[model samples]
Target: LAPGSSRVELFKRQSSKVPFEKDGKVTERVVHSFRLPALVNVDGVMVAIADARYETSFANSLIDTVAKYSVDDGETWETQIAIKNSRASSVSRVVDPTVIVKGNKLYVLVGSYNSSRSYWTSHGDARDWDILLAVGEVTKSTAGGKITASIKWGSPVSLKEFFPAEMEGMHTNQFLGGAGVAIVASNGNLVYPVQVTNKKKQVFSKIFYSEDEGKTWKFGKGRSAFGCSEPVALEWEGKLIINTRVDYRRRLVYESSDMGNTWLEAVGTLSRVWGPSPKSNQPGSQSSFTAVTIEGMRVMLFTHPLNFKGRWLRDRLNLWLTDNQRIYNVGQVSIGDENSAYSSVLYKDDKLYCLHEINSNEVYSLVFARLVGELRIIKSVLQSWKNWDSHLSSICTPAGCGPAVTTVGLVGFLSHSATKTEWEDAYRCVNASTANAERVPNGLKFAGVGGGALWPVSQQGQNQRYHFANHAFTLVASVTIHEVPKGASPLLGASLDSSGGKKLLGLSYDKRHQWQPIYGSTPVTPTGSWEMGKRYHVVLTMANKIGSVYIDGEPLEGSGQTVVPDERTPDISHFYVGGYKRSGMPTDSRVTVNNVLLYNRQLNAEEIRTLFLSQDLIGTEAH
Candidate 1:
């Protein structure tokens, strides 16, 4: 993880653990669960804010905004900041906060809805919503001899100051959660990725532009192909690509020659990800797109959940990259797995960070029968039909492909160019096991004894690849030490050589609870300290010949030097878990391990924070 920063969770309400029983069944009432997440880094400071809902369900819930700030890169979080919406007296509550930074100032935009009616159950054409904006400045200060960031906000106002009066009368509104962050273009123009809902309740995607900052904003007259929502805008290839969530099951993408004043279909549809249809009656697709540069080359990174399993299941959170002109189904990676949705991504220091929901506490009783079952049956049947159709059509050739091409379906059932296996093979965990390691309720328990798991080089998957020798990599693990060891104890060690002999890499803890990264024991201890009997998350990373260690989440001190490995000619023959054992020699390390993730890539600070917080959520094992 990158050095400096934290995530401070603010404004969480707990409903009673008091049980409710009906017909021999018991259940506990719970908080609605905070849904949308928007995070941004401004002037070396990080701010994470979200909507704190009154209940587990949206559409009908009281909501307010809460935030936490971190001065460190993302290691520690502070502040219990509560920001409420007070612009309109008739407005019920605020939801869907979108955050951004401009010049030296920060802003949080929210959507205001009426309490009288629910957005989903409203019978009329008008939506019960308005827009609100909060502007402020974030500055670092010292309180009680400690450092933190303080936010001083100005007056809260309706965003209608930047729009026409008629838009309000006709009930035109923008989805604040649509495009999570407003883009600051190279030309100094600020672009708010937004959507407009008219009096007929018809939705279309567009942009809100500001030339003189937030003093005023003008609506772009352009719109997307029909029924699009949650539009994500990005500047790519000297043009802006405005992609929207659609009921068509694919990302509706358009390119703007001008800065979002108009839109034209560049590829018509981006099939790399799937979206929800109208029958689902849910938020079709929630996506975030940001323009980034890699080595002076322009690229776009889009984040969305792959709901191929079913709508609202959102099993996989995938980060995809594109050159803006080629096949975009390339160079992708999964940042999240299982029960995740509604994400926002931020790019800084040549790295990408995503703020998303994971392992959402789902109740299967009432909501499942209405939404889950029908969607699952339809998806399975549709997939089966497509499989057979592809099999029958696959027998045709380019010269004699007449009857197979003659189709009479609405917009054609499936795209022949949609290839699912292209980027699926990018990463693999070939060998994962808990063999030779002791087991406990929490994880594989090491009882200060010798036995632990060992994986030979042949089963290392991409770990043994030649190109991965000195490249950037991440090793994350959740471990709880029963107590201090007799001496230096190894948590993980890997090499073809022995621990007392030639070795490559070893992560262990000294008697002082200071984490040590050992090549040949240069006696290096980073600043952060760990304690016994408490679970601490650890991340050991080696990127660009520089090594760093993070305890819990914050980067340690005294670890800023260039890293040089001891074994110049390295041969990683095995990975030893729990204790160091290579040549009949082992160490005494009593610890419990869970979710030992090994990535051939460096995970950013935010991703590491998510992983650390995700330990007990989805119940991930060693994979």
Candidate 2:
């Protein structure tokens, strides 16, 4: 809800009733769909482009590249304009539009395919696929005290000759421009993100750039690894950064310093753009990335589906802002249960405008939204981070400014006492929501039936927590059980929001006073014994989808379990302490939990031991 907290709808696809059969019954359903949005800000005019599909939602279906322009800064829009329509064409079709601006001209690049074939089946035939560019000259005028903008488009020109020659050998001659704004680098060169398929049918992300305006184009020597595609490129700090869609459930970042002559993997960067994993039924989707200056600081903006429930469900298109170090969720640009896909964004005069896709029951529409509330929040949070950084620098010591412990990926730490219904987070990230829980001397006490606390792992809302999607993380908590339950009860767990609320990874207390480490629904062999009234330091870690449990800084015997490789590691919608409804734990379970820590990366054995000892020293000093 935070990501799409507010938005202004600008466009929706037109629908028509179509006949279909379901359950052996014939019925007429309204059907429509669209894809590949591209948004750009030329001077003060906002232009939006997308592919309007017909008959089917498939990418290869008959399509038209449509454009719309808005004057008065997105306050009003002109009627839809068709740059290229394939409705009546038998041999030509266009899709995947990428737009950009240079001087007074607006450029739109698209991939044209023989109506009978898709990129997957195009092979290396030049007649099957061709790259086309449409150039539009813009002119603005004031009429009746209102600014009006118009564009005159020239005939579409072929850019297929510029396709990289080296790729021809591997049957990689076919390529498509990404569905977003192509960037003009600091040196006035044009760079467009593209993906090409090789002989083995592996897709790689590369860029086609133009140095001397649009007279000629060349391909980037560097390319992404196989199976990576749908990349968005931007110039950051004198380097070209391409965020590519990999088969894994996340986007990969590659950087080139010499204008794409060579690219190197940039890990630990843009860690919040969660996509589809290899095992997931969903495929990676197209996203938008752009750079802007906010409060005199360079910041980057990214937009993609929030996909909290699962990778297969794409909805809740959200915006994220980062400073090349820490990332923050700005809020949602569009919110709904419909599938939201393929977005483009432009920032101009303190307002962010987005053109994205929304599908409802197979009816897809290109939506344009103006993000004002999210932009304000982004600026406010960026200032807060700047202030925090300055304060730390001022308090620097010989060793460091803050605690000597490793806090690089420490997203959440709850050590302080709690309020009646609120448990404070020490890291100032996400605070836990308490239910039937009360503040106590040591920490928080869960009493009565269904007493517990929930920490958000997937949803960030106003918080700064990242979605723990297939990433290495460690969850540590200090807890004391008052009495052993007659049945197994959840001590701590990470779960999904699917039907029945599947528990992905968790630590539960069995009736036999033994620790239960759970992966998915089944519990692994019981480990270390637990005694009532005695506090224990419990650590649950996951690396590469394999889990390990530690008690008192020691590993649980035979506790390491590899989760189903064919299933996506749960995005962890909630981290629960004590039992929840779906967990099937008794309501009367009593426990006191505190000193909880959640890291984005796995903590080593030494770090865990040091953390446990430090907590002991603090407790002794307090006593």
Candidate 3:
């Protein structure tokens, strides 16, 4: 035993002590199943509940919602008690058990769904859905400084009457998964999350609250937005913060200050990167949240995979902290790698424990780990980029381009010249002169009314290495608009060629006081307005002839965006900072360019969030 724990390995799946016959031969003894673990410390006893399956595959799978008890701080959980395991492997089954402790008794709530859905949503029903509750008391005895329990469960009671009457006879019914562990608020209100996939295949999440301590529950209003699922909520500053998995790559949130009576969508710093693969219907990226007091400050702790560019298997489980102000990744410790999903996190008795799942050889098993000094000992490498990273790179140079550009993902970047020389070829100055430009804290100040910045040597030289020919790239700029000069101020623009006619693909603040994406001459406007004399993290992305824009961490409205159908008369060759390429006339575009970042590949939502979070390091020595 490490410390105050068990030494013998207690595996999650049932050991192959007995073999079962299948496909004209004996299959492995321990079949492939056991997942979605919920762990709680009840007066010194470790109570664990999870899904236990019988068959090797989900085909005709029978799940048992079971509980395991440990007295010596989870060193050995020797007793297993079945709460709701109907031994028959049939279409009608129950899974996903959420257990809570209250008033010296244990209460278990689970989803009772008929498996009529072609897609099994982790023990959730799409049409005929209800809930089942079971209660039991642990009679504990302590001897030799050890604790044991007499664990017996009562028969489950169906809570179908708790569902809304208006939900009856619906084509796709509403349900809650056991995967999202329920919360017991300070006011003795038992709160849980529920979701429904409407006829449009879009998800709507709501809240269910029990005032009488697990007797009856009333439903809350569904959110205004759709395509969100598998939600979990935490009570923060008297506001309920609910986060949901989505059909898109990112996880979305809604915050209700009035006890779930009203909700406002809350955008967070991290995005969804792993969980379900493309083959599955966007259901696997589930996560959990917990509120803890660390160093006398209320901290919101979130758990999920920190890796995105690898196999979709949700590995590299990480811990993130937020003081309700900003979210930061402290560190990551290797736990389990393959197919991690639907985890639950809890902070109890001055320690943190994470109950999660991992699949091995097609068998899903529950696992737990005590988050030790990993967060303080291990350092995160993502924050350290000696390369052309969008997150943190105030300046880019030849030595800075070391292995990034050759790595097949980085495009290029332009910043302060490391050689302290300008008006040259690498990044040329057009009408705007950088010769005596004032170098502010993090950016260069350009003339308000006239001049601009361009590349590929307009008047003197030509360089083909920096040419962008419509493959895919992202342009990031930290800008503070002093004032709008005239018709429109170009924040970022690209020209087709270096010649006289410079057809631009640009993003600018139109005279209408809106951000718009310009395709040659036609402009498609996105929503959101900028404030004068304030800095904004603005980014423009173009891939596959499609473009998107993000103002801060959230996406600017691009619902009606339409890319140029075909390639223009000339292929894109030049890029500009302020105005387009015009020989003599001054391009009256006025904006302070902070730091421009260029990436060869289109960054996902999570990566964009990272960029905004790293803005504080712009002019610091940390950069």
Best by lDDT: 2
- Tens digits of per-residue lDDT, candidate 2, 108-182, equal 888777655454534645556778888888889997897888988777788978875565346565787766787
**Model 1 CA deviation exceeding 4 Å by range:** 1-31, 80-82, 86-91, 120-128, 142-147, 165-179, 268-283, 326-337, 362-623
How well does model 2 score by local distance difference test?
0.69
Candidate maximizing TM-score: 2
Ranking by TM-score: 2, 3, 1
Scanning candidate 3 in windows of ten residues, the lowest lDDT window is 423-432
Query: How much lDDT does each candidate structure score?
Result: 0.54, 0.69, 0.56
**Alpha-carbon RMSD of each model:** 24.4, 9.2, 13.5
1 versus 2: better TM-score goes to:
2
- lDDT score for residue 608 of model 2: 77
Model 1 C-alpha lDDT per residue in residues 69-124, reported as the tens digit of each score: 67764566664334554423333567666666786577777777665445632335
